[PDB]
Amino acid sequence: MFWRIFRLELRVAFRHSAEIANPLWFFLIVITLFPLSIGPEPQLLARIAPGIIWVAALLSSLLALERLFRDDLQDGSLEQLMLLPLPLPAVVLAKVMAHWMVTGLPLLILSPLVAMLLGMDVYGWQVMALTLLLGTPTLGFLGAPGVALTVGLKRGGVLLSILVLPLTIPLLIFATAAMDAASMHLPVDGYLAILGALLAGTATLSPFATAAALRISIQ
Amino acid sequence: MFWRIFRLELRVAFRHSAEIANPLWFFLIVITLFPLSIGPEPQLLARIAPGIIWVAALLSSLLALERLFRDDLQDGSLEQLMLLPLPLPAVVLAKVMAHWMVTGLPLLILSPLVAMLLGMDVYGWQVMALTLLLGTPTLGFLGAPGVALTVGLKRGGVLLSILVLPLTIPLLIFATAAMDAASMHLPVDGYLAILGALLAGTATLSPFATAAALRISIQ
Amino acid sequence: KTLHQLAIPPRLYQICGWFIPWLAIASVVVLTVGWIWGFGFAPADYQQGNSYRIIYLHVPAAIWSMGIYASMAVAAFIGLVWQMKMANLAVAAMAPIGAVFTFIALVTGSAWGKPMWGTWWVWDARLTSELVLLFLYVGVIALWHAFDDRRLAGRAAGILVLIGVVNLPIIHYSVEWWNTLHQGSTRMQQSIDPAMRSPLRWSIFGFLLLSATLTLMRMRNLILLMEKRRPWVSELILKRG
Amino acid sequence: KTLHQLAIPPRLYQICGWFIPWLAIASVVVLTVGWIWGFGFAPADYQQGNSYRIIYLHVPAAIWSMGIYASMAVAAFIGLVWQMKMANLAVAAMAPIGAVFTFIALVTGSAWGKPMWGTWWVWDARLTSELVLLFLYVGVIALWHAFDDRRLAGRAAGILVLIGVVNLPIIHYSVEWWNTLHQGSTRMQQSIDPAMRSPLRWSIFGFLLLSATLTLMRMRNLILLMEKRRPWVSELILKRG
Amino acid sequence: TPAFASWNEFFAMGGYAFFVWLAVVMTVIPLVVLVVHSVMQHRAILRGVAQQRAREARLRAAQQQEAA
Amino acid sequence: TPAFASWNEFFAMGGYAFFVWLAVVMTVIPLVVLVVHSVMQHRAILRGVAQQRAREARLRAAQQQEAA
Amino acid sequence: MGMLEARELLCERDERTLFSGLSFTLNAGEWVQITGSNGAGKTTLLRLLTGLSRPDAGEVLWQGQPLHQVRDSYHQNLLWIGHQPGIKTRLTALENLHFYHRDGDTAQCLEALAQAGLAGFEDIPVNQLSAGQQRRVALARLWLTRATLWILDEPFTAIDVNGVDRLTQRMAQHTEQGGIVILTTHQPLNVAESKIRRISLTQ
Amino acid sequence: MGMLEARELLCERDERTLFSGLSFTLNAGEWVQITGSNGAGKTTLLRLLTGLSRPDAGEVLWQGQPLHQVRDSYHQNLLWIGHQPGIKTRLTALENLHFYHRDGDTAQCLEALAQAGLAGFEDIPVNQLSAGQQRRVALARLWLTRATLWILDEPFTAIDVNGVDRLTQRMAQHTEQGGIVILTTHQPLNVAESKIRRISLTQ
């Protein structure tokens, strides 16, 4: 029944399709803001591009995190998902996987456009697409405790950022280190191995600590 | 009665003081993100610091903008504030001025610290404090229409950013150009004059386009 | 007069119905003549060579991607003062067309700047201003969609159309000053040799006609979307057959 | 036994009440001994000169800045298994003390780094790790404040304390590796000349006693907040006079 | 009167042949998407009204069954 | 046994005095603030309970007035 | 003339025609009650009557002028209490009532909060109060207002019978001089049928 | 034994002691109705029995085992309908009912949605439906479930009299085969007093 929840969340996401583009439009806003401040200089932008790309990715996923749980509290669907005959770790895993398929895949297909806007080569696009693929699920799994904790609040938009971003600091460092090594044309296999290790660890541990937070917030 | 609304909004904001610091902690986390991505090199950080400062300031103010109108929707206060014997332009002006005294003055007192973490000198701190003083009111008046429309929405966290940030692009260009002309020591009076000109124009035009908008959002 | 009868939604439906075909075929004729007299039967620039043909696919796609927005203000203004709902539907009618014209302007500008600059996207003032215009179109569309009620969504869209229009000279001149400060640009948008000019003007007028056709057809789409229960649609659909 | 009676709220209140004064005066004596044997009656580092006394004001303020958080983990763990509300209250008791200790560590680290680096903030691994720890403390405190119900706020704080402790070694070693590349660092925090050692250990134990005193005080404050109506407070305040 | 003397040389505009046809195709596609989307939207709204009004007729049939 | 021979030279810690005394003052102040906010909060809670219980006594006085 | 007159009000919330063609004029000193049958849609009528909601077609009039023009004189003579009480939960009850005009001095303060049933709970924060006692602050605003027109979306939601009796006595005292109180309530109210008027939005 | 047994449940929502020492056991095929006075706090009681909210003191018991252990068997035998219907407004009614178990084939679909009163509104989107008809999807979930335990927070809200009659007929039919329907309703209900049992959370 774990797949029925995932397929239904995909159906509700795909019904009004428009709203899933707003994370990538915000991502493109944040890509736009830095060269306006810095300048049009292509060497400085070529060096600074990992910082822009990953701060934009963190903020775009973070603002997209509201759709992960804020809908089902008001509709009452979150309660009924909690009393499904399934352990709530699996329900949380299904919601985070659907959220990655609705918020991380838009960034992964938008990846050629941002790779052409800043100026990275085809190796840079390959490493950034692979690192986005290994990192945006980790954004989902670190954001899920914060959303589960701050779904009861009316004003939970700044607080969710404050909780999530220090958790995403290690992924930030390894992702930007991977693409700093990629810009100098080095093999980035080890950095992707650490990225996959963090992905596996957070994917294992985050449903079990998001389920408890979600039980706390509803009651 | 324009001042009683302003004093009451200050009392509600100051009664639970803690929340006011959450914009500046989000600001400080966003300052923390780019040294970790770019690197600890002080010449590059000194060059990029205007961009970090204004991306952080726009995002901190933008996530802070939810408290400007979202509280009064559920409490029912906003309807009664339209039904005071006062033109709702003045009510909107009082709320935005109070929000600047709640969201912009924390940044202006935090200004020495973020000047210390980015290597700017005393002239750099002076220009960035003056530029924040002339810019964050403009941030409030441009954010007020976006909050006014996205107060009725359940999902108004990404949409608010999409509306507000292209409006605030000219503030970005003139502010970061002012700090670029401050880093290599030049008189920056003209850039501050343009900042004040945009401040006066948006302060003139934003209550009159926020009052009717807030009427649309609620009926 | 009949201008007051231009507010009844079924009457606007048949007026748009008979102005789609003739205006559409006129658009096809004018734009076909413009491109056939521009991408051939025409010289080339001396410096840029045979890459000047892009100045067709960009410049009606640029100017009208502002012009639609300017016309949008007019509709939004009619939405705010006289409380005309159908002008607020016209805003939502023209928002995707303006967004697509802006995307075309960006794509043709990048494809033009590659054989000169060497890369697809140099942060030029023109392309950056077009990108901000695209962002404003996305904001208007997302407001029109994220709301449930269509009427109030149109009123909301009209409000941000007017906000964007008031802030649009400021953004354009601030971006032009941004390129003034850092590094200059070449003569790209409207630095035209004579006798390559009339195909461009013909393509501009053809893009105007195509935008008017697409506007006048999505207006029918939105009118059918709101009046899905009133009996005039019933009489129309029983007339269908 | 009496460990089960330690979860009774009035009994825990008088246990904290008689534990504050004696532990506080012991803390004052030990920390005074520590600073007064470290700031004088002690040598100074040969290279850094007399700027090495700051290693007291940093290092009990650094280690216990983690220690409190680690102790917070223990309380948060007691929150989730045995469902003891007072451990979740102890999390909120210890979070501001850890935040203030972290702020002291950051400020003294910057004051130590000025006579060497020349700038108040060179992005060293230790100060960056303490800054991330401070952000974690602010997250815990702001969750404890945002919620209305105090019990549910403490349970939410326990959840995020366990999240932060799970992800904290990852942050520390990632920041350490972040200055494995991107230049290196000197031996500053725990490279100590002998005979300049017992003052630092005495100050560490004194900061432990001060943290326990402030914990034992704010635990009473939060207990008085939560049971503001129950009659044990009534008998206590009618005993006051 | 054509500037390009050879019709085969017309498809390769002086070396800069990829960019012109790239933007030609990337302009033709979104206009076709707009026209197809708008025509299909009009057809879909009309067919949705058809289904709704057939269901309204079935409501009328149910009312007649209740009346009889 | 003091490393600093002069007690006046103790206050000027070998040239590096401003940083040491700056962090000393900026360490003493926040801990004093935390102790003050831990004492004043306890006093404020107890006095707020006192006001609540005086008002509860006036509730009981009102109940006695209604009974009489 | 009557001051409040509604002329051909039609409302379509989410393309559902709640009411159409309703037009009623109200002379001074009457206590019309909006009967209704649906739960929402009479609240929409009250919000249309206060000027929160623009009529989709037709118009509301205050003393012969449309509501889009005479806002600064209409809002000076009206008191609106919706389903949400309209007070701030963060502030205290006395300061929440002092935000609204007068209050302050004892001629207009500390008996207005008492006659609603909130005697002795003046200085407590609102968020530590029961929901009926939260609504009684806005209900206590009645004894201090100078507004001729009162509009009430469910005034009697979780107030005890003595509170409803005091509210109806104050409301009838208001009705004695020139003034209209429009209200919507579920409960059958204990005033004679001769005084009241029922304006029902029929379906 | 009876399966659902409540033992010394104590709850303080926002430090207000809602109920204390309350302990009730339910044998099979009994039809307890909560008859408390306060609006909120009986909904809180239903959330404590369903396992949404942990009891602050005491425990809820299902077949002799506490609720923190037997979740995977308790949630196989319960159907909970709150004040919110628990369905998605974005999807259609048939897909919303198909989310919950079975539906699909005509043996368990398209008459379950009919006996709630939603015949002819099966494929319409939920957001274009009246609020009572939105609740009737969750109410239609009753005819397809195998859950022995049904717990209902205001089922007969915005429901026509024929709908309440049909719901009570299906609900007494459930009561026949050992099924318990724990419910809270505002309206006076048309079933004989011999069959019912009332659990009052006094004070």
Residue numbers in the entry:
A (entry chain B), B (entry chain b): 2 to 220
C (entry chain c), D (entry chain C): 3 to 243
E (entry chain d), F (entry chain D): 2 to 69
G (entry chain a), H (entry chain A): 1 to 203
What does the paper say about this structure?
Here we report cryo-electron microscopic structures of the heme translocation complex CcmABCD from E. coli, alone and bound to the heme chaperone CcmE. CcmABCD forms a heterooctameric complex centered around the ABC transporter CcmAB that does not by itself transport heme. Our data suggest that the complex flops a heme group from the inner to the outer leaflet at its CcmBC interfaces, driven by ATP hydrolysis at CcmA. A conserved heme-handling motif (WxWD) at the periplasmic side of CcmC rotates the heme by 90° for covalent attachment to the heme chaperone CcmE that we find interacting exclusively with the CcmB subunit.
